[PDB]
Structure formats: structure tokens, C-alpha cells
Design a protein around this nucleic acid. Structure first.
Ligand SMILES: *C(=O)[C@H](CCSC)NC=O
Ligand SMILES: [Mg+2]
Ligand SMILES: [Mg+2]
Ligand SMILES: [Mg+2]
Ligand SMILES: [Mg+2]
Ligand SMILES: [Mg+2]
Ligand SMILES: [Mg+2]
Ligand SMILES: [Mg+2]
Ligand SMILES: [Mg+2]
Ligand SMILES: [Mg+2]
Ligand SMILES: [Mg+2]
Ligand SMILES: [Mg+2]
Ligand SMILES: [Mg+2]
Ligand SMILES: [Mg+2]
Ligand SMILES: [Mg+2]
Ligand SMILES: [Mg+2]
Ligand SMILES: [Mg+2]
Ligand SMILES: [Mg+2]
Ligand SMILES: [Mg+2]
Ligand SMILES: [Mg+2]
Ligand SMILES: [Mg+2]
Ligand SMILES: [Mg+2]
Ligand SMILES: [Mg+2]
Ligand SMILES: [Mg+2]
Ligand SMILES: [Mg+2]
Ligand SMILES: [Mg+2]
Ligand SMILES: [Mg+2]
Ligand SMILES: [Mg+2]
Ligand SMILES: [Mg+2]
Ligand SMILES: [Mg+2]
Ligand SMILES: [Mg+2]
Ligand SMILES: [Mg+2]
Ligand SMILES: [Mg+2]
Ligand SMILES: [Mg+2]
Ligand SMILES: [Mg+2]
Ligand SMILES: [Mg+2]
Ligand SMILES: [Mg+2]
Ligand SMILES: [Mg+2]
Ligand SMILES: [Mg+2]
Ligand SMILES: [Mg+2]
Ligand SMILES: [Mg+2]
Ligand SMILES: [Mg+2]
Ligand SMILES: [Mg+2]
Ligand SMILES: [Mg+2]
Ligand SMILES: [Mg+2]
Ligand SMILES: [Mg+2]
Ligand SMILES: [Mg+2]
Ligand SMILES: [Mg+2]
Ligand SMILES: [Mg+2]
Ligand SMILES: [Mg+2]
Ligand SMILES: [Mg+2]
Ligand SMILES: [Mg+2]
Ligand SMILES: [Mg+2]
Ligand SMILES: [Mg+2]
Ligand SMILES: [Mg+2]
Ligand SMILES: [Mg+2]
Ligand SMILES: [Mg+2]
Ligand SMILES: [Mg+2]
Ligand SMILES: [Mg+2]
Ligand SMILES: [Mg+2]
Ligand SMILES: [Mg+2]
Ligand SMILES: [Mg+2]
Ligand SMILES: [Mg+2]
Ligand SMILES: [Mg+2]
Ligand SMILES: [Mg+2]
Ligand SMILES: [Mg+2]
Ligand SMILES: [Mg+2]
Ligand SMILES: [Mg+2]
Ligand SMILES: [Mg+2]
Ligand SMILES: [Mg+2]
Ligand SMILES: [Mg+2]
Ligand SMILES: [Mg+2]
Ligand SMILES: [Mg+2]
Ligand SMILES: [Mg+2]
Ligand SMILES: [Mg+2]
Ligand SMILES: [Mg+2]
Ligand SMILES: [Mg+2]
Ligand SMILES: [Mg+2]
Ligand SMILES: [Mg+2]
Ligand SMILES: [Mg+2]
Ligand SMILES: [Mg+2]
Ligand SMILES: [Mg+2]
Ligand SMILES: [Mg+2]
Ligand SMILES: [Mg+2]
Ligand SMILES: [Mg+2]
Ligand SMILES: [Mg+2]
Ligand SMILES: [Mg+2]
Ligand SMILES: [Mg+2]
Ligand SMILES: [Mg+2]
Ligand SMILES: [Mg+2]
Ligand SMILES: [Mg+2]
Ligand SMILES: [Mg+2]
Ligand SMILES: [Mg+2]
Lengths: 96, 76, 63, 51
RNA sequence: CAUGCUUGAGGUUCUAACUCUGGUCCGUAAUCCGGAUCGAGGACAGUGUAUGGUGGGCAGUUUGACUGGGGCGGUCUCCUCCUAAAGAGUAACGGAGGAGUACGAAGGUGCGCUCAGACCGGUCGGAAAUCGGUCGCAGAGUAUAAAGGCAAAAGCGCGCUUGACUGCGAGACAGACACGUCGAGCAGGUACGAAAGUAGGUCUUAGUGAUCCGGUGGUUCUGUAUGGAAGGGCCAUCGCU
RNA sequence: UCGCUGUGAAGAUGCAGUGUAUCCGCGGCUAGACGGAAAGACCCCGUGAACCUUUACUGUAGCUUUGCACUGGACUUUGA
RNA sequence: UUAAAAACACAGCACUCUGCAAACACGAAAGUGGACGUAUAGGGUGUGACGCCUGCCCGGUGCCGGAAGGUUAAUUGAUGG
RNA sequence: AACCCACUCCCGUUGAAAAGGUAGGGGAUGACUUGUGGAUCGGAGUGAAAGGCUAAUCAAGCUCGGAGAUAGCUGGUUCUC
RNA sequence: AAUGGGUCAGCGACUUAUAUUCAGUGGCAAGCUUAACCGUAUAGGGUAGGCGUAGCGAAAGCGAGUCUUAAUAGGGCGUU
């Protein structure tokens, strides 16, 4: 960071933003990783029985990336608009 | 001594010469006052800057009364 | 041991998939005499200049 | 010199413009009509204090 | 207005707290130290803690650079001309000058008009005031230095007026970075004009200061069990010869 | 391990040109070897060091002011 | 251990502080010196036998005195939001 | 004269000697000289005051630790193509 | 005629630990790899954790998009 004595960048530009503590217990799951849980059920504990998410994650959102391997039911986890529609394409339901 | 002062150069002059292809918004001449006047297809900035308004080729014609020097844009 | 990230650099530069973001200087005070065009164009965020990348990634302990 | 002043909109919004004036020469309060972005109309603005 | 209940301030006195580097008794064989008893002072002094003043007695430090050696003197940021060799840029303690502002109209628009000066005639004013005529074409003018511009006058006058607008922005000029400069066009609302249209400050180039921190006006953000708040974030803005 | 005149990081035993001169000691004198000694003390520089000064800055020992505590009784003047 | 002097001391002079558990000095303190002294005494400061003398200024900065008024700390907490 | 000191010249300067010697010199009953034992010391002591002395060391002793302090400054940096 | 070296022999100066980035060379591959620890103790277990498969925004959040904005306008960053 030295510059010869001239004012350095990390003191010439302003600070901005704040760190979110709400996002520290959040995770996202691709639609391609849905067919790795044990059986036909995607939950918070089942995504942790497999190594898809860390043990401290409390909120999961599913987003569209790839294709869903089989028909899974999603329990207690959110999904996007495209992520949802592709799930019922492969006979998978979406309750709670 | 009571003299050691000056000012930073302003980089004035012609930026595109006769025959060069131009685009809209391209700066043609930087001036103090108007050595050159805006011809066809050229506009005048508030500090007397000539900029292209259409696509084409620089012309650099002098014509009309008053012996003015005009910068115009023509077909390519 | 573990490299220690510079605290002041991390508050001014945020790492994204495009590069490193930052805000613009000359917007804290003395804003009346400025032109609204000047103030409107210093408002967003921009990526680090190509010649500033090396000195900042070394300050953030990214290289 | 030219003291700094403030123009505040006559709508309920807190939107304000800023400029300066010569208070010795002009004891009048500036009463100008300007554009308010929040309500998207031209309304009246009134001089106030910058502080 | 005496009263009854409290407290603030002062003075006077008393002894019982504390003080005695005062006497005599004991421990004891002892000008220490304790205990007892007389004597004096006495809620004072003195010590702890909180606080204002004084305090080189003592301490940790600072006290710029350029520079035909250092000191003394001068300079340190910005604008105009020359040096600068007909693109841009180009140094010297090289040669000359300016700035650290002004303007709510000195801005926008529509309409209208040409200056300085010379001569001749005319009541006092007389080389020079206001008026008439002829010539003149810019030798005038431009808020402010100099250079470059100025008839669609960019100069002058009047009516209406707030575009000295909000979100942007194709494309460029400059440039180590941070900063800088020009801008057609699109969307919202406007002002002049019958209308084509013009208007995102002033003929242009100087009139300036990063970050941190703190203050004010807004806010579909966050807010340490939860509902709020405090605090933080985003936009606007104020405070550094 | 010569002199001179030039050249040359600018005052040459060692370079150019030239002139002199068999090889080696001893006793004496100090003109040169920018001779020996001491990483110049003069001058400048280093965002070096010490010690000294004061109305430089920031503190401090000591001295002093007042609130509370150790700390009580009575009377009296005045205030709410 | 490159300076023996015109430098220091001195007897004499003056100012100033100190009433005794003295001022003052060394000690985080107890204590000790001053002094087993008591204003003809003790400390500090300047001048420097002797003779003739030592003139004007209190505006600056010190010290001494005064208490009326103006400011002024911890502390207290009326009022308002 | 002894004793204490150190004013001048010369020698010596790799010295006989890390401060002397030969010639002269000052005080020599006093604020004198000296033996033995004791007290005061490192931001401290002591000083008839030269910033002098505190073990050949003094504008802050020596010794061991922090400590391989820091050195934008000199010096050095080893086989071949 | 600026420094250093009287000579010989021996010694004498780019190291190590932990975190990382780039290149070469290998193991697996939308997955790769374990740390403390257990253990027959270089095997084997242990996948807590780290990196990658998705970005935009200060954030709530939305997500092949997102942010700015009155704006499915423009523009910034991202996507085969
Ligand atoms: C000056 O000429 C200098 C004298 C210094 S005395 C400290 N030269 C000395 O040789
Ligand atoms: Mg896991
Ligand atoms: Mg000049
Ligand atoms: Mg000059
Ligand atoms: Mg120049
Ligand atoms: Mg120039
Ligand atoms: Mg225009
Ligand atoms: Mg941090
Ligand atoms: Mg801001
Ligand atoms: Mg500013
Ligand atoms: Mg009694
Ligand atoms: Mg006593
Ligand atoms: Mg007793
Ligand atoms: Mg008391
Ligand atoms: Mg007291
Ligand atoms: Mg006290
Ligand atoms: Mg000091
Ligand atoms: Mg001080
Ligand atoms: Mg001191
Ligand atoms: Mg220090
Ligand atoms: Mg210092
Ligand atoms: Mg000092
Ligand atoms: Mg300083
Ligand atoms: Mg200098
Ligand atoms: Mg000079
Ligand atoms: Mg010279
Ligand atoms: Mg010179
Ligand atoms: Mg000077
Ligand atoms: Mg010129
Ligand atoms: Mg040129
Ligand atoms: Mg040229
Ligand atoms: Mg140059
Ligand atoms: Mg000036
Ligand atoms: Mg004008
Ligand atoms: Mg106008
Ligand atoms: Mg006339
Ligand atoms: Mg005309
Ligand atoms: Mg270019
Ligand atoms: Mg418009
Ligand atoms: Mg109309
Ligand atoms: Mg709580
Ligand atoms: Mg809560
Ligand atoms: Mg808030
Ligand atoms: Mg010979
Ligand atoms: Mg020569
Ligand atoms: Mg020669
Ligand atoms: Mg030779
Ligand atoms: Mg030769
Ligand atoms: Mg020869
Ligand atoms: Mg001989
Ligand atoms: Mg001799
Ligand atoms: Mg000789
Ligand atoms: Mg010599
Ligand atoms: Mg050395
Ligand atoms: Mg040297
Ligand atoms: Mg000196
Ligand atoms: Mg300095
Ligand atoms: Mg320096
Ligand atoms: Mg006190
Ligand atoms: Mg003598
Ligand atoms: Mg003396
Ligand atoms: Mg006396
Ligand atoms: Mg004297
Ligand atoms: Mg006085
Ligand atoms: Mg007086
Ligand atoms: Mg007084
Ligand atoms: Mg003897
Ligand atoms: Mg002696
Ligand atoms: Mg002597
Ligand atoms: Mg003799
Ligand atoms: Mg004798
Ligand atoms: Mg003798
Ligand atoms: Mg005598
Ligand atoms: Mg005698
Ligand atoms: Mg004796
Ligand atoms: Mg001792
Ligand atoms: Mg001393
Ligand atoms: Mg000694
Ligand atoms: Mg010391
Ligand atoms: Mg010291
Ligand atoms: Mg020793
Ligand atoms: Mg010793
Ligand atoms: Mg060392
Ligand atoms: Mg250390
Ligand atoms: Mg070398
Ligand atoms: Mg030689
Ligand atoms: Mg030399
Ligand atoms: Mg040599
Ligand atoms: Mg050298
Ligand atoms: Mg040298
Ligand atoms: Mg040598
Ligand atoms: Mg590979
Ligand atoms: Mg887009």
C-alpha cells in the first residue's frame, strides 16, 4: 500500500456499505444437486445428511441451474420462479 | 526575481484532419473562440468545441463572406 | 502465520465476479458549487483501474 | 461574500435545492418555481437556512 | 407577622472524636515505642478520594523542501502570453501579468438597434454635458489579467419568465492513479414564440481542498430472544489561508 | 622502482616523443613517492543521537483551592 | 593529563524568607539534618577590603496587599424534549 | 631545608615513564600536610565552580540482560556454458 | 596520485517455519480434499471444515438475471 508518501488508495476513497448478519445462516442449492439426497425428499436435515450445505445453515433457496434428476418433494425450502416450474416438470411436487 | 509562474497546457488544436472517418460525438477541434466554425453535420460545444453529429468524413472548407473557415462532414 | 488483511482496504473495496468495486471521491462536502452533471456522474460504483489492481490485491492479501 | 442558502419545496416532501445569495444587496427571500422529482411537477420553492 | 418541619451560609462557645517532636508513672536497667494519668489545642489541623490554579523542579518529542555549497532573502496551488524549434507536450532562483470572486439578473426566450471618434450649426457649460446634420466602419464594447473570438452580432434595450430542471446518456478529448473536459439523443415535467424552434447557467479559458470525523433533511434497508427503539447503511447537504 | 616536454579522472617511475645511464654497497640531507598514523573534528546530508534553554507542544513531582469521609453538642445572625 | 589567570573564594555590604513541631533539604513513609540552635539565630540571592558615592522610571514581567464587582471546577438537578 | 604544589626553558614523544627528568620556581604555624578506619554514587553523589571528579573510562561510570534494537547509509557476496 | 588487500592455510554471507499467488508436472473429476484425532500405526478410518458448480445489489431481497430509475427506457456488472 505504500506509494512514496502520496495519499494511498485505501485512504483516498470512501468507505461504503454494511455487512449483513442476516445472510450468515443462508445457503443456495442448484436444481442439479437435488438428485443427491437419499430418497425423494429435500429438507434441511436431508441436505445436511448429504454434504450439500453446512451444519449451521437455516434457510435454503433453490435456483435454476441444470436439470432435476428425479421427482423430489421439497419440504420447508424456498425456490425461485423458474426453479419451481422445472421441478413439477419431472413429476416433483412442492408442499410447504 | 518575481516571475516564476505559468499554467498547465490545455492540449488545444485539431484532433481529426481532412479525410479521416468520423463517428457521431467525435470531437474534431478544440478552441479558444472559433478559429473554425461549425459547418454541415457539426455542432458547437459551450466552450467552442466542434463535435461530429453524423457519420462521414472531415471536409475543412473555407467559404462564404467574412472568410470563415468551416468544418463539415460529408458522405463516405 | 496467517496473513492479516488490511482493515481499511476491505471497507473500501468489495470483491465481486467482475473485479473490485469502490465508490467515488469528491462527494463528501462542498457540493453546492459543483455541477449536477458532475455530482450525478460520481454517484455509482466502478471497477478498479488495471494499474491499481496489483497494489490492492496485495493489501487485501489476495496475492 | 455570498452566504449559502437553501430552497425547500412547497410540497410535503423534504426535497431541497441549494445555492448562494448576497444578503446585503437582496433582503428579499427568493421565491422561485422549480421541479420536484418526488411529486414530478413544477412547484414553488422558498428560501431557508443552510444550517 | 412569634410559631411549628427541613435545609443553605456565617459567627460564638463546649468536649467526647482526633493531634501533641509537653509533664510524671509503669513495662524497664531504656530521651525508642506502647499503656495510664495531668496539660494544651479541638471538630480545627491532618490523611484518603474527586476537583480548579500554579508548576522547565522533571520527562517524551517536534522545529519542511527547493537552492549554481549551507545560512539570509525569495518561492510552494490555479489562469494568460513568450521561451517552445508552423500537430500535442517540453526546463531554469528565465522574461511579463492575473485569481482564491461577481450576478435572481449581468440567466432563458421573442422582438427591436448599431459603437469610438472627427467636423460643422446651436441658450449660458466650451477642448469636453444635452440636440441636429455629414463622414467613419469597429480604431468601441465584453463584470474581472492576457490570448483567441464576436453580424444569426457573443455588443445594446424592452416584454414575459426560471432549462442556474430531475433520471440518464451513444460517442469522444485528455490522462500513472485519484480527478478532469465536450456532448447528440431518450423519458418526465416546464418557459418564451403564430410557428420552424431555442433553453441541462454567463464569449471561452482562473475564482480552489482527498479521506477520516461530527451535524442536519429524507428513506420499500438493517436493527444481537421477540415487538419497538438506540446505533448503522443509502440519497441530499454543512463544517479545514 | 631515471630526467624533460606533452597527453590523461584535469599536478605521471610506469602512457607518447625524446635525452641520458656499466652491476652493487656505506656514511649523510630530506625535494617527491599527493610518504606513515587516525573510515576528516571544518562544510553539507540522515524525516540520525545526546545534553542544554524558554512566554514551542503535551504531560508531570511538589505546592495550593473546594465537595465527601474520619466529624460531634448548644446558641445565635441571615436564606429558601 | 596542552589554559593558574583578570576566573572561584574571601572579610565587609544589602535585599528577602523563617516565631520553632521554624523556613529549607534527604526520604512513597517513619524519621533525619538545620540544632540538643531560637531573630545579635538559621536559609536563599546578588555585590565583593578601604575612601567618596550609589541619580530618574512601577509602563512590561515578577513579588506583596485588598476585597467590591465580572468570569470560573468537581457537585446539585428546576425546566423542557 | 624536609613536606605539599607545578610558573619557565630544554630533552624526551617507538619515552627510563600511557604525563617524567635536569636546571631555575611558589607556599612552608596554616583556609596547612599526612597515616589509619568510616560516610555519601549514577539523572545520582561531591564540587573555594574548571561540565571538574566518581578506579588510566564522564554534557551522565562499569557490568550483565531487553538484544541479533534500528541503520532509506558505507563495505562484501564464492563453479561453468 | 580515489577505496581495500604483506603472504599462505583453515573458516566466512539469500536459510527455516507458517499463510498464500503464478508456472511446470501428476491424481481424481461436477466434483476435489481432509484437520485434530483413532489406529497394525507412512496402511486404513475420520469429510467437522475449505474451495468449486451463479450472479446482481449497501442491504432486505430477487435470481439467468439483478441494480439505478416514475420507466418492460437507456446504462453498469453477470450468463452459451
Ligand atoms: C577551518 O579552517 C577549520 C578550523 C576548525 S577549528 C574547529 N580547519 C581546520 O583545519
Ligand atoms: Mg458439510
Ligand atoms: Mg510570469
Ligand atoms: Mg520567470
Ligand atoms: Mg509549461
Ligand atoms: Mg501555452
Ligand atoms: Mg446549446
Ligand atoms: Mg475487519
Ligand atoms: Mg454521501
Ligand atoms: Mg467535495
Ligand atoms: Mg480535656
Ligand atoms: Mg525537630
Ligand atoms: Mg511515650
Ligand atoms: Mg479538619
Ligand atoms: Mg481539608
Ligand atoms: Mg487532600
Ligand atoms: Mg525538556
Ligand atoms: Mg510545558
Ligand atoms: Mg526538563
Ligand atoms: Mg522514541
Ligand atoms: Mg528530538
Ligand atoms: Mg531535545
Ligand atoms: Mg511536525
Ligand atoms: Mg536543504
Ligand atoms: Mg546559494
Ligand atoms: Mg558554486
Ligand atoms: Mg556547485
Ligand atoms: Mg531560508
Ligand atoms: Mg502573445
Ligand atoms: Mg507547439
Ligand atoms: Mg515542432
Ligand atoms: Mg524536463
Ligand atoms: Mg499574486
Ligand atoms: Mg453579456
Ligand atoms: Mg439575459
Ligand atoms: Mg453630436
Ligand atoms: Mg445582422
Ligand atoms: Mg488520443
Ligand atoms: Mg425538453
Ligand atoms: Mg405556448
Ligand atoms: Mg437485547
Ligand atoms: Mg428485536
Ligand atoms: Mg434510524
Ligand atoms: Mg637509478
Ligand atoms: Mg593537461
Ligand atoms: Mg605531467
Ligand atoms: Mg608499465
Ligand atoms: Mg612512458
Ligand atoms: Mg617514453
Ligand atoms: Mg645509505
Ligand atoms: Mg634528517
Ligand atoms: Mg624524504
Ligand atoms: Mg602530501
Ligand atoms: Mg565505521
Ligand atoms: Mg568518513
Ligand atoms: Mg559543528
Ligand atoms: Mg523533517
Ligand atoms: Mg528525508
Ligand atoms: Mg491537587
Ligand atoms: Mg597562581
Ligand atoms: Mg576557578
Ligand atoms: Mg541573614
Ligand atoms: Mg563579581
Ligand atoms: Mg509593576
Ligand atoms: Mg502598579
Ligand atoms: Mg492577591
Ligand atoms: Mg609523601
Ligand atoms: Mg592541583
Ligand atoms: Mg600548566
Ligand atoms: Mg637551562
Ligand atoms: Mg623550594
Ligand atoms: Mg623542578
Ligand atoms: Mg608570601
Ligand atoms: Mg618561604
Ligand atoms: Mg587527620
Ligand atoms: Mg553505595
Ligand atoms: Mg556535576
Ligand atoms: Mg579517571
Ligand atoms: Mg547515568
Ligand atoms: Mg541519558
Ligand atoms: Mg571494566
Ligand atoms: Mg574497571
Ligand atoms: Mg547489530
Ligand atoms: Mg527487541
Ligand atoms: Mg562488491
Ligand atoms: Mg603510484
Ligand atoms: Mg584519499
Ligand atoms: Mg590506488
Ligand atoms: Mg568508500
Ligand atoms: Mg570514497
Ligand atoms: Mg592499504
Ligand atoms: Mg489438473
Ligand atoms: Mg441489463
Amino acid at each position: 500500500g505504500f506509494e512514496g508518501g502520496q495519499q494511498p488508495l485505501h485512504r483516498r476513497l470512501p468507505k461504503f456499505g454494511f455487512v449483513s448478519l442476516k445472510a450468515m445462516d443462508r445457503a443456495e442449492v442448484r436444481t442439479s444437486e437435488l438428485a443427491k439426497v437419499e430418497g425423494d425428499v429435500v429438507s434441511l436435515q436431508t441436505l445436511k445428511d448429504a454434504n450439500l450445505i453446512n451444519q449451521h445453515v437455516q434457510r435454503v433457496k433453490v435456483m435454476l441451474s441444470g436439470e432435476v434428476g428425479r421427482a423430489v418433494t421439497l419440504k420447508g425450502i424456498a425456490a425461485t420462479k423458474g426453479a419451481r416450474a422445472a421441478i413439477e416438470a419431472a413429476g416433483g411436487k412442492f408442499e410447504d | 526575481t518575481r516571475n516564476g509562474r505559468d499554467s498547465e497546457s490545455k492540449r488545444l488544436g485539431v484532433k481529426l484532419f481532412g479525410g479521416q472517418a468520423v463517428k457521431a460525438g467525435n470531437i474534431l477541434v478544440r478552441q479558444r473562440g472559433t478559429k473554425f466554425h461549425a459547418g454541415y453535420g457539426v455542432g458547437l460545444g459551450k466552450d467552442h468545441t466542434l463535435f461530429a453529429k453524423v457519420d462521414g468524413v472531415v471536409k475543412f472548407e473555407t467559404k462564404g463572406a467574412f472568410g470563415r473557415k468551416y468544418v463539415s462532414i460529408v458522405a463516405a | 502465520p496467517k496473513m492479516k488483511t488490511k482493515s481499511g482496504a476491505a471497507k473500501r473495496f468489495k470483491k465481486t465476479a467482475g473485479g473490485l468495486k469502490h465508490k467515488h471521491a469528491f462527494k463528501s462536502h462542498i457540493l453546492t458549487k459543483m455541477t449536477t452533471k458532475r455530482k450525478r456522474q460520481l454517484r455509482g460504483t466502478s471497477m478498479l483501474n488495471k494499474s491499481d489492481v496489483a497494489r490492492v490485491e496485495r493489501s487485501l492479501r489476495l496475492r | 461574500m455570498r452566504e449559502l442558502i437553501r430552497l425547500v419545496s412547497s410540497a410535503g416532501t423534504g426535497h431541497f435545492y441549494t445555492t448562494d445569495k448576497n444578503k446585503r444587496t437582496k433582503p428579499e427571500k427568493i421565491e422561485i418555481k422549480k421541479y420536484d422529482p418526488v411529486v414530478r411537477q413544477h412547484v414553488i420553492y422558498k428560501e431557508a437556512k443552510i444550517k
